[PDB]
Structure formats: structure tokens, C-alpha cells
A paper describes a structure:
determined the three-dimensional structures of these four agarases. initiated by GH86 or GH16B, which generates NAOS. depolymerized by GH86, and systematically saccharified by the exo-acting GH117B and GH2C enzymes. exo-acting β-d-galactosidases, while GH117A and GH117B are α-1,3-L-neoagarooligosaccharide hydrolases.
of the GAL residues in the −1 subsite. with the GAL residue in the −1 subsite was identical. classic CH–π interaction with the GAL residue in this subsite. pocket, at the base of which is a serine residue (S326). residue (T82) in the place of the phenylalanine residue (F77).
Residue numbers in the entry: 21 to 644
The structure:
Amino acid sequence: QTHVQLNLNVKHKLGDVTEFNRPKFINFHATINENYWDSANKIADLRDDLIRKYDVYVGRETGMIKTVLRNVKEDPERPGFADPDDLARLCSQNKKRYVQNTKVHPYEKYSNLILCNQFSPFYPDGTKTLKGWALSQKDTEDEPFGTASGEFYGRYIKEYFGEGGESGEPKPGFCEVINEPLWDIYDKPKAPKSSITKLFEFHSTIAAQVKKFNPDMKVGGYCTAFPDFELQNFGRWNARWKQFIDIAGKDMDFFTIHLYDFPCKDGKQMYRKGSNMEATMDMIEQYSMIKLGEVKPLMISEYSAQTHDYNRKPWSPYRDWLRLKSTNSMLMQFMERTDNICYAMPFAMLKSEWGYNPKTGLAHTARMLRRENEPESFTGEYVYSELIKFYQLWKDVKGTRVETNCDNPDIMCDAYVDGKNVYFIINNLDFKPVDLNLSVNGTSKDAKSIEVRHLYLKGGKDGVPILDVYDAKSLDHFTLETEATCVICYNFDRKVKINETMEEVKYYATDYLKEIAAGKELVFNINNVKKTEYGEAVIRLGLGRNHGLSLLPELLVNGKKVDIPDNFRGDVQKDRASFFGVIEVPVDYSILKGNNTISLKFPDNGGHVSTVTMQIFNFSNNIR
Ligand SMILES: OC[C@H]1O[C@@H](O)[C@H](O)[C@@H](O[C@@H]2O[C@H]3CO[C@@H]([C@@H]2O)[C@@H]3O)[C@H]1O
Ligand SMILES: OC[C@H]1O[C@@H](O[C@H]2[C@H]3OC[C@@H]2O[C@@H](O)[C@H]3O)[C@H](O)[C@@H](O)[C@H]1O
Ligand SMILES: [Ca+2]
Ligand SMILES: [Ca+2]
Ligand SMILES: [Ca+2]
């Protein structure tokens, strides 16, 4: 059994973040003004049900800007530039439409828009628009590559957006440069395999042009389709994200990636959830520290699962479950880094009827709504898909973060206190049910009530997701289902008193990315660590090694032996080509000091230590 402990009087502080951020986390890939809200739905006022009742935020949109780019006339004075007058005209037409759409204006308080360009025709590779012209491909001193694309983007933002309501749509919170560019440039079938670093320079040019027209706008990149750092023995890291940080890092306000699990690609299960995405995110942060001297805010503008083996099938509840389980796990992991995550958006769109292909009968694979007669036919009014269960599960969750601990790296836990209510969230990374023994410490009173919410799969493969919601007189034990999530809601007679603090600080090494040779000591240094009287600590070993190679180095911390656990967060990565993941190693707090030496010795040759980082948890008093 796994012991899960909730210390509800102990605030968990990370940087200056102490509270659950619903807009940052409980959101989806939509806008308040898409016309799909307003027709063909069983629920008459769908915004009120989805946005208001469930308290769900938006969003991200690429289609409006694409339509303007693809239809704008060319500047007669400057070949390869959008005409400023026609651009203003098209933007004005759209702005007028927004201004007249008064029913959506009260929902602006739920919206912080991520704007982004689709790859084509924004990337200036010669692709022509519907008006028969291509964005300038020049790369001169006065017209660096992407100048015309950048000017288009900057002018679009300036011309279309207003200050809310009758003044126009509020400005975006964040401007991503370009969606999944290296997928199109390098990796897709029949990709041209043009210059990778040219794309990175393009980001600097775009940022400068956007900020010429819109000085306060945050710009980011590179919006990576598949951040797969270990590939080609870390050659992929060295050619891509390393270079992007080196070239454009100083010019970006935020970094942005996409994170998709592959639960079923030609019958293989290749997950990021668990230790793999920890390694990806640690490598971005660690190298940012080395090169830039700071961690850059990270956006995850799309995440969950891509379901290859089900993507030529019609809709099913099971396909939605594949997405749900990835979303819940990834979300917990992003919550653990809330101080350095600026936005994380599960990839679920509202309706995307544009994505329905009448040739094949295939609807879009990530929708909040589906037609009543699906999967048999794409007919009938729209009703919620199973993805609504995510928003049902997370309903109400807010408040001050408090300390949890669970003694199984495959179980993730978190908790938030909102007055009299406490939300205790537990997620399973294991592929079997896990029996939990629950302890709630820090109050003298029993809860007045307990509501259990449990999201799991019934009936195995091709089964259905179930959201069980029930009241419990007590909850000392609970079986969490395979890859399942529960949210346990405790309600107390009076407001819960939070009277202690646990402050988490994450420290980075002076170096990274070291090759492993058998019996050869690798030495890392983590310095200026601040200790208090009482604390705990975790060393985070990012390892990228072929299968068959040891994940159990000899570890010395300040000359003292520290044991490495057999179990780490998530799966052993069997169907992946190699192992890439962070092994989390608890370390006795008394071994640590301000300047620390971490030594690793492996028994075999090959692979790399990608990163060594450390989390310190400092307590206000002797809370253990
Ligand atoms: O990298 C593996 C690929 O497998 C293919 O079977 C799949 O079609 C392909 O999907 C693509 O993935 C991202 C890049 O472009 C979109 C497309 O669906 C998506 O954003 C990819 O998964
Ligand atoms: O494919 C054209 C449509 O794309 C929609 O947005 C998509 C694209 O960017 C976000 C979202 O998903 C990605 O995979 C991209 O393909 C857009 O909303 C529509 O109006 C069309 O442009
Ligand atoms: Ca990409
Ligand atoms: Ca990559
Ligand atoms: Ca494990």
C-alpha cells in the first residue's frame, strides 16, 4: 500500500506562488467569440454552462490571423509585404464584427489569449497566399529574414485588437511566433530540410517587429511539436533547443513547447508523463541558467495525448479517455513548477467543425462537443464529449497550496485550501490499481463532509471513462484505479488554519550534459544553497541512456554515500528507443551544505547525464 499524507496547515510556497491558478491551468484551446458556441448545440447557453458554471478559461487561436494573411493584398510599393491599407481594412472588418458581438463581451474576464501563426504561409519559404504573392524571403542587413512576416504580425495585432467590448477584442496576453515550425521544415514526410538555425534567427526578427508596433507584447517560441532531446545521442538537443536558446533566447519573453504522450502508435506506448517530461523541462531550465543566467517562463500551449491508432476512427469515449489520463498527469507535473510555467493548455477545442472531413467521415480528434449520433453518423445536435469530465473533476479546485507527500514515485499528489474546503488531488502513473492509505494532519477537527471524485476507465480497452462522485463518511483507504485521478473534497465547519510554511527552492548545477564512461567519476556542483534548521531535499538526476544500461550509479553527495531508489516516476520506457528521464533521489538534509559536490559513477559505458538539479524544502518549524 502507498502512504498519502496531507499536511493541511503547512503552506507549500514556490517562489512567490502560493495558490492554485485556475486561469493558468483549467482552460482549453478556444475563444469566447467562436461562432460554434451559438449554433447546433443541445445546451442553449453553452458559454454559461461550460465557461461560467465550471469556471473554465480560454484560450488560443490561429485561424483568424491565417485567414487575414491568406487574403490580404500585397503592398504595391514593396513586393512580398502585406499592404498596410488592405491589412487595416481586413482587421477593421473583423474588429467591427467583435464590437457588435455584445453577447460575448461579459466573458472577456475568462479570456487571456495566446495568439500564434500557423506555419504556412507565415514562414517565408515562397508559399503563395490566395492573392498569389509570397511573403518576402530576403535576408539583408536592412531586411533581415522574416521582416515582412514580422511587420504583418505587428500590424495585425495593432489594427485588430482593442481594449475590450465596444473598443475591440482585448490584446493577446502572449504572442507565439509560429506553430510547430521544425515539423514542417525538417521532420514531416517530404519536409524540405531547410536550415534549422534560420528558423531560430527568424524568431528574433519577428519579436522585434511585433514590439516595434506593440511595445509591451510578450513574444515566445519556438512552439516545439516534439521536444525529443535525447535523439541522435543528444544531437537533437544540440542542434535545436540548445541553438534556439543560444540564438534567440535573450529575445524571447517566454519559451513554448507542446507535450504529447503517444499511448498507441502502431501498438507502442511511448509516454512523456512521468520522468521523461521532467527531464525535458529540467534540460530547458538548466541550459537557460547556464547560457542566459535565468530560467525563462515556459508555456505549454498544447498538451495531452496524440492517439495515432485511433485517429482514422470515429469518435469514441475510449479515445477521449486516452486524452484525459494524459491531461491529468501532465497537469499535476506542471503544477509542481507553477513558478516557472506561465500557461499550460490542454489541447481540446470546442467543436472544430472545419476539421470534419466529409470524404472520410472523420471528425476532429480533440473536441469538447460531439454530435449526438456519433460515432455512427455526424448528425444530430452537439452534446459534451467525455472531455467534459476533466472540467467536472477539477470543478471548484482553488486555494492556498499545502504540503502533501506520497511515498510512491508513481503516485503524484497535491492539495489546495480554500477557506473551509480542502482539495486533495491524487494521480496514478502506474498501469495497475494502487491501494492508498490516507492521513490528514494539521487540524483537530474532523471534516463535516468528504466528496470523492474518481476518474477512471471501465471495461478496459475500448471501454468508457467514469467519473464517480460520492459522499464518504470516512476515507482512510482508497483504491486509485489504473492511470486514474481522484479529487477528494473535504469540507470543514470553519476555515482551515494554515500556520506553517514549507518553502521549495530549486537549484541548478554549474554544468550539464556529460558523457558516461564506465568507472569514470562525473562531478557536478550545486552552490549557494540556503538551508534552515529543518528541511528535506531531492536530487534530480536526468539520465539519457540506451536500454540495458544502468540507471543506478554510485552517488556521493559531499563525499557521503546516498542510495538511489529502484523506483522512479512513471514507466520504464520499454517501447521508447532509449531511456530519458529524471530519477528523483531523496537525500538526507544533514548531508547538504551551501556548496555541494554531487558525484556519479556508472558501471558501464554510454549515454549522458543530461542534468543534475536539486529541490530543497525548508520548513518554518520542526513540522516532522
Ligand atoms: O511524429 C510522429 C508522427 O506520426 C504520424 O503518424 C502523425 O500523423 C504525426 O502527426 C502530426 O503531429 C503533430 C505535427 O503535425 C500534426 C500532425 O497530426 C501534429 O501537430 C506525428 O505524430
Ligand atoms: O487547419 C486549419 C484550421 O486550424 C485551426 O487551428 C489549429 C491550428 O492551430 C491551432 C489548432 O490546432 C493546430 O494543430 C493547428 O492546425 C483554426 O482554428 C482554424 O480556423 C483553421 O485555420
Ligand atoms: Ca517544431
Ligand atoms: Ca527537439
Ligand atoms: Ca515507476
